[PDB]
Amino acid sequence: GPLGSMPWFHGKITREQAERLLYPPETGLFLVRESTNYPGDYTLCVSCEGKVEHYRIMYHASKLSIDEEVYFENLMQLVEHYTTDADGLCTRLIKPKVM
């Protein structure tokens, strides 16, 4: 891998690429990509019954957070939390969007 084993993190995907990628509705399919509209942050796209939910990820002080209450040290641990429980997600993570 790039730096371990984080394929779910594309770090370079467009709206058209993210839309088609999440074509088939399957609760648990998530994907992270560099926020286009907001440079410097990330966006998590999940498929909930065919709907694409985008979760803005704020990166400050070398820490990530979406609820502005739970800060992490990296995207790896961040996903682990959202995978074990919703934590504010329409559907807990189940299968990472492998690219």
Binding site: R15, T36, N37, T43, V52, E53, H54, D87, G88
Partner: protein
């Protein structure tokens, strides 16, 4: 013009690449944000 008794809300995301005239209001409007159960 059906009753409309269906629960579903699409989401057409758009990046500054295709729409650089988008503001925090529009961009954020395309997000769900953390929404815990209850």
């Amino acid at each position: 013009g059906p009753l409309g008794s269906k629960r579903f809300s699409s989401l057409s995301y758009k990046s500054r690449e295709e729409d650089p005239t988008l503001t925090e209001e529009e961009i954020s409007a395309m997000y769900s944000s953390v929404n815990k159960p209850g």
